[PDB]
Design a protein around this motif. Structure first.
Motif, PDB file in Angstrom:
ATOM      1  N   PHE A   1      76.518  51.277  23.371  1.00  0.00           N
ATOM      2  CA  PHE A   1      75.646  50.132  23.550  1.00  0.00           C
ATOM      3  C   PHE A   1      75.595  49.753  25.036  1.00  0.00           C
ATOM      4  O   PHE A   1      76.612  49.848  25.737  1.00  0.00           O
ATOM      5  N   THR A   2      74.432  49.270  25.494  1.00  0.00           N
ATOM      6  CA  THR A   2      74.258  48.986  26.875  1.00  0.00           C
ATOM      7  C   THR A   2      73.624  47.621  27.133  1.00  0.00           C
ATOM      8  O   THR A   2      72.844  47.126  26.318  1.00  0.00           O
ATOM      9  N   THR A   3      73.912  47.064  28.297  1.00  0.00           N
ATOM     10  CA  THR A   3      73.280  45.831  28.805  1.00  0.00           C
ATOM     11  C   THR A   3      72.839  45.970  30.242  1.00  0.00           C
ATOM     12  O   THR A   3      73.257  46.926  30.922  1.00  0.00           O
ATOM     13  N   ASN A   4      71.915  45.105  30.674  1.00  0.00           N
ATOM     14  CA  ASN A   4      71.608  44.989  32.109  1.00  0.00           C
ATOM     15  C   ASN A   4      71.669  43.546  32.621  1.00  0.00           C
ATOM     16  O   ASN A   4      71.145  43.268  33.706  1.00  0.00           O
ATOM     17  N   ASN A   5      72.388  42.658  31.943  1.00  0.00           N
ATOM     18  CA  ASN A   5      72.463  41.263  32.410  1.00  0.00           C
ATOM     19  C   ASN A   5      73.710  40.927  33.167  1.00  0.00           C
ATOM     20  O   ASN A   5      73.929  39.748  33.479  1.00  0.00           O
ATOM     21  N   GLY A   6      74.601  41.890  33.368  1.00  0.00           N
ATOM     22  CA  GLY A   6      75.766  41.570  34.157  1.00  0.00           C
ATOM     23  C   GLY A   6      76.965  41.327  33.294  1.00  0.00           C
ATOM     24  O   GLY A   6      78.047  41.054  33.812  1.00  0.00           O
ATOM     25  N   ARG A   7      76.846  41.532  31.977  1.00  0.00           N
ATOM     26  CA  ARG A   7      78.048  41.424  31.181  1.00  0.00           C
ATOM     27  C   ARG A   7      77.979  42.348  30.016  1.00  0.00           C
ATOM     28  O   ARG A   7      76.898  42.755  29.615  1.00  0.00           O
ATOM     29  N   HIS A   8      79.154  42.568  29.423  1.00  0.00           N
ATOM     30  CA  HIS A   8      79.296  43.383  28.226  1.00  0.00           C
ATOM     31  C   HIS A   8      78.694  42.649  27.065  1.00  0.00           C
ATOM     32  O   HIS A   8      78.535  41.433  27.173  1.00  0.00           O
ATOM     33  N   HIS A   9      78.332  43.366  26.014  1.00  0.00           N
ATOM     34  CA  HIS A   9      77.987  42.706  24.730  1.00  0.00           C
ATOM     35  C   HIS A   9      79.181  41.853  24.343  1.00  0.00           C
ATOM     36  O   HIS A   9      80.329  42.248  24.585  1.00  0.00           O
ATOM     37  N   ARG A  10      78.931  40.682  23.767  1.00  0.00           N
ATOM     38  CA  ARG A  10      80.018  39.838  23.277  1.00  0.00           C
ATOM     39  C   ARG A  10      80.556  40.308  21.941  1.00  0.00           C
ATOM     40  O   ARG A  10      79.854  40.970  21.140  1.00  0.00           O
ATOM     41  N   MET A  11      81.795  39.970  21.625  1.00  0.00           N
ATOM     42  CA  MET A  11      82.313  40.437  20.363  1.00  0.00           C
ATOM     43  C   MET A  11      81.638  39.818  19.135  1.00  0.00           C
ATOM     44  O   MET A  11      81.591  40.459  18.102  1.00  0.00           O
ATOM     45  N   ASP A  12      81.018  38.652  19.271  1.00  0.00           N
ATOM     46  CA  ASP A  12      80.285  38.089  18.137  1.00  0.00           C
ATOM     47  C   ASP A  12      79.108  38.959  17.768  1.00  0.00           C
ATOM     48  O   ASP A  12      78.552  38.838  16.684  1.00  0.00           O
ATOM     49  N   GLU A  13      78.697  39.807  18.701  1.00  0.00           N
ATOM     50  CA  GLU A  13      77.599  40.707  18.445  1.00  0.00           C
ATOM     51  C   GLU A  13      78.005  41.880  17.544  1.00  0.00           C
ATOM     52  O   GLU A  13      77.160  42.636  17.064  1.00  0.00           O
ATOM     53  N   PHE A  14      79.308  42.032  17.324  1.00  0.00           N
ATOM     54  CA  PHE A  14      79.804  43.081  16.444  1.00  0.00           C
ATOM     55  C   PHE A  14      80.456  42.467  15.208  1.00  0.00           C
ATOM     56  O   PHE A  14      81.126  43.171  14.446  1.00  0.00           O
ATOM     57  N   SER A  15      80.231  41.183  14.952  1.00  0.00           N
ATOM     58  CA  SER A  15      80.966  40.559  13.864  1.00  0.00           C
ATOM     59  C   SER A  15      80.144  40.592  12.602  1.00  0.00           C
ATOM     60  O   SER A  15      78.938  40.807  12.642  1.00  0.00           O
ATOM     61  N   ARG A  16      80.826  40.361  11.496  1.00  0.00           N
ATOM     62  CA  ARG A  16      80.182  40.218  10.210  1.00  0.00           C
ATOM     63  C   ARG A  16      79.271  41.430   9.880  1.00  0.00           C
ATOM     64  O   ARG A  16      78.269  41.296   9.174  1.00  0.00           O
ATOM     65  N   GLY A  17      79.656  42.625  10.344  1.00  0.00           N
ATOM     66  CA  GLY A  17      78.931  43.857  10.022  1.00  0.00           C
ATOM     67  C   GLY A  17      77.679  44.167  10.831  1.00  0.00           C
ATOM     68  O   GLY A  17      76.989  45.152  10.581  1.00  0.00           O
ATOM     69  N   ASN A  18      77.446  43.424  11.883  1.00  0.00           N
ATOM     70  CA  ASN A  18      76.258  43.634  12.696  1.00  0.00           C
ATOM     71  C   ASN A  18      76.581  44.398  14.001  1.00  0.00           C
ATOM     72  O   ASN A  18      77.737  44.421  14.375  1.00  0.00           O
ATOM     73  N   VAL A  19      75.629  45.131  14.592  1.00  0.00           N
ATOM     74  CA  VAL A  19      75.782  45.618  15.994  1.00  0.00           C
ATOM     75  C   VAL A  19      74.509  45.306  16.803  1.00  0.00           C
ATOM     76  O   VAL A  19      73.425  45.122  16.215  1.00  0.00           O
ATOM     77  N   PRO A  20      74.621  45.305  18.139  1.00  0.00           N
ATOM     78  CA  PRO A  20      73.590  45.197  19.180  1.00  0.00           C
ATOM     79  C   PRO A  20      72.439  46.203  19.093  1.00  0.00           C
ATOM     80  O   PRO A  20      72.628  47.368  18.705  1.00  0.00           O
ATOM     81  N   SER A  21      71.248  45.808  19.495  1.00  0.00           N
ATOM     82  CA  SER A  21      70.084  46.667  19.317  1.00  0.00           C
ATOM     83  C   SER A  21      69.970  47.768  20.389  1.00  0.00           C
ATOM     84  O   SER A  21      69.527  48.872  20.124  1.00  0.00           O
ATOM     85  N   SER A  22      70.367  47.451  21.612  1.00  0.00           N
ATOM     86  CA  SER A  22      70.439  48.429  22.683  1.00  0.00           C
ATOM     87  C   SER A  22      71.459  49.514  22.355  1.00  0.00           C
ATOM     88  O   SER A  22      72.632  49.378  22.735  1.00  0.00           O
ATOM     89  N   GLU A  23      70.974  50.690  21.965  1.00  0.00           N
ATOM     90  CA  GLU A  23      71.906  51.753  21.658  1.00  0.00           C
ATOM     91  C   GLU A  23      71.387  53.168  21.849  1.00  0.00           C
ATOM     92  O   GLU A  23      70.209  53.471  21.722  1.00  0.00           O
ATOM     93  N   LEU A  24      72.375  53.991  22.164  1.00  0.00           N
ATOM     94  CA  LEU A  24      72.374  55.438  22.415  1.00  0.00           C
ATOM     95  C   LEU A  24      73.353  56.189  21.581  1.00  0.00           C
ATOM     96  O   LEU A  24      74.343  55.564  21.168  1.00  0.00           O
TER      97      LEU A  24
END
Length: 131
Positions: free
Chosen positions: A27-50
């Motif tokens: 997973f990737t970002t361009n805002n200057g920070r890592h994805h937050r862990m709440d973004e991986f909680s409750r069975g969900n993941v971030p949309s930016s992916e490779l």
């Protein structure tokens, strides 16, 4: 925390030819920070992916060259790739190292295996423009 030390007076390659690759979800970002862990909680993941097929001895540098094939804008010299492993404890994070494009750095040969990557984990890359 207990600590182990060893006399400093090595790590080994994977025979990639004889080993099935693992599937790494990146997973990737361009805002200057890592994805937050709440973004991986409750069975969900971030949309930016490779997806990357690789081996346990993949290096940050090897991984950075694959990201550059896909984000052309990441190509520019000095672009910063900051790497983290996201792993089930829900999830947690651990920054592992950084690279930049067109430059040699001390974490370039750091491998997934050296960082206790376990299959099933994700890789998170925070990408930032050149200094």
């Amino acid at each position: 925390e207990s600590r182990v030390t060893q006399e400093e007076i090595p790590e080994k390659p994977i025979d990639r030819e004889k080993t099935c690759p693992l599937l790494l979800r990146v997973f990737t970002t361009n805002n200057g920070r890592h994805h937050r862990m709440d973004e991986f909680s409750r069975g969900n993941v971030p949309s930016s992916e490779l997806q990357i097929y690789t081996w346990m001895d993949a290096t940050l540098k090897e991984l950075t060259s694959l990201v550059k094939e896909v984000y052309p804008e990441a190509r520019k010299k000095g672009t910063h790739f900051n790497f983290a492993i996201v792993f089930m404890d829900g999830y947690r994070v651990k920054e592992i190292g950084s690279t930049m494009s067109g430059r040699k750095g001390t974490d370039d040969s750091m491998t997934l295996q050296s960082q206790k990557f376990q299959i099933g984990d994700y890789l998170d890359i925070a990408i930032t423009p050149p200094n």
